[PDB]
């Protein structure tokens, strides 16, 4: 009814740090919430079309759609379609930066250039292959699939010859696509699944060959009116979809997709090629309840938790919906309340633990902060853990290291000098970056509220110790 989103196109999910990424497309921003929908940070907070890099408040987007998350480096790859670019959001350094593209609709069908030297034509989804460090891009404008190499910044064509046609050939130049709007990698990292929007079909792209094979939809030979689109469940060439925009391959190997113009979610088994409808009557509307009687309105993006919760960008309703998949019959689609998401204009947060410290009673002294990790977790060495100090009435207390990075052992020392008789409150906000052996980026956001009221003139040297307590899978 009162959604803070305007036409969200795509989603990505980070399950280890409890983060849901939303492309609020018609507000030209990415919105990060926790998986219960409480606001964490927004990116491109102006809300206006643009193409600027820099901090999360200098930065601007022009209709971002597809999102991909990099768990080893804590980056979000964006498909900035109307800027014809691929943007990279770095959360370690709170800057946005452009990896390829340059703002103008290029007409390059071969490519192979480095960084912003290579132009693009309306990229629409992105998926991140973590092993070979490649970003695959469903380039809707040129009817091809492209490949960004994170190691040399070279962006080249991967498959499709440039013609708009459902043609599943055996080499990159003998295949065609038709406004490919979604892409998801299989758990074997051997195939990618494409939502070939204009051909109204799901296709499987072979990541070694460069070729593709059709899985379901877009076949007129068996369609009752010889139309390549419709709304019909079945197997293979009996299936009819209408403009699927999103596709996701879950770890159980099944393919979840949004049959966008039919306002349904569907499930496709890539070996039987059987497609069944999961949720939605077919009628463009909003109503949630049991799956078979509910309503979406042009769903176009999907993310999934390991547990089995499927999130849906319900784009033409501007909601985020979710479905708990392993409840089977009783399966109901529900809506995600977005708490604290505040629309754009030209302190506190939701993922940050708040620790109250015993009041500091000396006029002057040294405050030692020692953050430790549980066993088996170590500090990241490529992303150093940072802190920043503020005090309740500025200048009530003076701290020399207003900003600092912790030592490799998680410690720092702040020197303080209180100016008044009166009570004040300091807040030490620190982002800690740590990992298990796998080196997947975990992080914790901790803010220490240090109350300050002079009760003695003799210097002291209190200690703040804190153990991080990582999140539960």
Curated annotation (Swiss-Prot):
Required to maintain light harvesting efficiency, especially during nonphotochemical quenching (NPQ) recovery, via the regulation of chlorophyll excited-state lifetime probably by preventing the formation of a slowly reversible form of antenna quenching. Disruption phenotype: High light intensity-dependent and irreversible nonphotochemical quenching (NPQ) due to a decrease in chlorophyll excited-state lifetime. The chain holds residues 562 to 1044 of 1055 of the full protein. This is Protein SUPPRESSOR OF QUENCHING 1, chloroplastic. It is found in: Plastid, Chloroplast thylakoid membrane. Residues 1-473 are lumenal. NHL repeats lie at residues 4-36, 50-86, 112-151, 241-271, 293-326. In the N-terminal section; belongs to the HAD-like hydrolase superfamily. In the C-terminal section; belongs to the thioredoxin family.
